[PDB]
Design an enzyme around this catalytic site. Structure first.
Site, PDB file in Angstrom:
ATOM      1  N   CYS A   2       3.327   5.289   5.694  1.00  0.00           N
ATOM      2  CA  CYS A   2       3.495   4.125   6.516  1.00  0.00           C
ATOM      3  C   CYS A   2       5.020   3.747   6.514  1.00  0.00           C
ATOM      4  O   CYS A   2       5.647   3.881   5.475  1.00  0.00           O
ATOM      5  CB  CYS A   2       2.645   2.976   5.969  1.00  0.00           C
ATOM      6  SG  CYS A   2       2.719   1.415   6.836  1.00  0.00           S
TER       7      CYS A   2
ATOM      8  N   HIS B 201       0.828  -1.233   0.000  1.00  0.00           N
ATOM      9  CA  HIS B 201       0.000   0.000   0.000  1.00  0.00           C
ATOM     10  C   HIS B 201       0.828   1.234   0.000  1.00  0.00           C
ATOM     11  O   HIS B 201       2.036   1.240   0.340  1.00  0.00           O
ATOM     12  CB  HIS B 201      -1.041  -0.007   1.160  1.00  0.00           C
ATOM     13  CG  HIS B 201      -0.511   0.316   2.508  1.00  0.00           C
ATOM     14  ND1 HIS B 201      -1.196   1.133   3.368  1.00  0.00           N
ATOM     15  CD2 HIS B 201       0.680   0.025   3.131  1.00  0.00           C
ATOM     16  CE1 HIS B 201      -0.521   1.250   4.501  1.00  0.00           C
ATOM     17  NE2 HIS B 201       0.633   0.582   4.376  1.00  0.00           N
TER      18      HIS B 201
ATOM     19  N   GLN C 155      -7.477  -3.194   9.735  1.00  0.00           N
ATOM     20  CA  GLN C 155      -8.677  -2.342   9.780  1.00  0.00           C
ATOM     21  C   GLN C 155      -9.634  -2.847   8.696  1.00  0.00           C
ATOM     22  O   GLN C 155      -9.235  -3.222   7.522  1.00  0.00           O
ATOM     23  CB  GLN C 155      -8.272  -0.884   9.579  1.00  0.00           C
ATOM     24  CG  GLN C 155      -7.623  -0.308  10.869  1.00  0.00           C
ATOM     25  CD  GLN C 155      -6.956   1.078  10.646  1.00  0.00           C
ATOM     26  OE1 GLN C 155      -5.937   1.178  10.018  1.00  0.00           O
ATOM     27  NE2 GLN C 155      -7.549   2.120  11.173  1.00  0.00           N
TER      28      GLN C 155
HETATM   29  O1  LIG Z   1       0.095   5.026  11.811  1.00  0.00           O
HETATM   30  C1  LIG Z   1      -0.874   4.502  11.311  1.00  0.00           C
HETATM   31  O2  LIG Z   1      -2.016   4.854  11.673  1.00  0.00           O
HETATM   32  C2  LIG Z   1      -0.622   3.411  10.212  1.00  0.00           C
HETATM   33  C3  LIG Z   1       0.597   3.151   9.666  1.00  0.00           C
HETATM   34  N1  LIG Z   1       0.375   2.129   8.847  1.00  0.00           N
HETATM   35  C4  LIG Z   1      -0.910   1.733   8.936  1.00  0.00           C
HETATM   36  C5  LIG Z   1      -1.457   0.689   8.207  1.00  0.00           C
HETATM   37  C6  LIG Z   1      -0.619  -0.356   7.802  1.00  0.00           C
HETATM   38  C7  LIG Z   1      -1.136  -1.420   7.028  1.00  0.00           C
HETATM   39  C8  LIG Z   1      -2.520  -1.455   6.744  1.00  0.00           C
HETATM   40  C9  LIG Z   1      -3.374  -0.423   7.191  1.00  0.00           C
HETATM   41  C10 LIG Z   1      -2.839   0.666   7.917  1.00  0.00           C
HETATM   42  N2  LIG Z   1      -1.553   2.523   9.840  1.00  0.00           N
END
Ligand SMILES: O=C(O)c1c[nH]c(-c2ccccc2)n1
Length: 144
Positions: A94, A40, A112
């Protein structure tokens, strides 16, 4: 039509295209595993759960400004002007950016939900449109 796909009408051209309400992908042509592997590119905004990243200690961009950035990266990736990995390395908020945005393989029950649902509804090789979660806005590429 496979999960999430609907037939739609283009406001620009009046041609039929197909829209996926689970990945937000759209395409001109007419289109479940236990594990998938995805990369992603995440663009965070001032309402993210953690408005901070390796790129910027304080993220101040609005949700709308994040969506324009995401749409410009999707444009470049679809035109072939940039590849997904390259923009994930440079611009993803990320820490997976250091791995070309690769998250490895995962099953349902781990990410999520809007991320998980988009990941499992993509075909191998397919990229999502903008996917919103509490982290921010994502482009997701299913690689396996
Ligand atoms: O800091 C955050 O909120 C974050 C960073 N990476 C992600 C994330 C990583 C993989 C799938 C969905 C979100 N959330």
């Amino acid at each position: 039509l496979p999960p999430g796909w609907e037939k739609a009408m283009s406001r620009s051209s009046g041609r039929v295209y197909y829209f996926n309400h689970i990945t937000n992908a759209s395409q001109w042509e007419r289109p479940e595993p236990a594990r998938v592997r995805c990369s992603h590119l995440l663009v965070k905004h001032s309402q993210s759960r953690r408005p901070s990243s390796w790129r910027q200690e304080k993220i101040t961009r609005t949700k709308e400004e994040a969506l324009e950035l995401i749409n410009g990266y999707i444009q470049k990736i679809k035109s072939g002007e940039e590849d997904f990995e390259s923009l994930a390395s440079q611009f993803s908020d990320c820490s997976s950016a250091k791995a070309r945005g690769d998250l490895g393989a995962f099953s349902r029950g781990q990410m999520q939900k809007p991320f998980e649902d988009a990941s499992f509804a993509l075909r191998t090789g397919e990229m999502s449109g903008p996917v919103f979660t509490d982290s921010g806005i994502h482009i997701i590429l299913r690689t396996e």
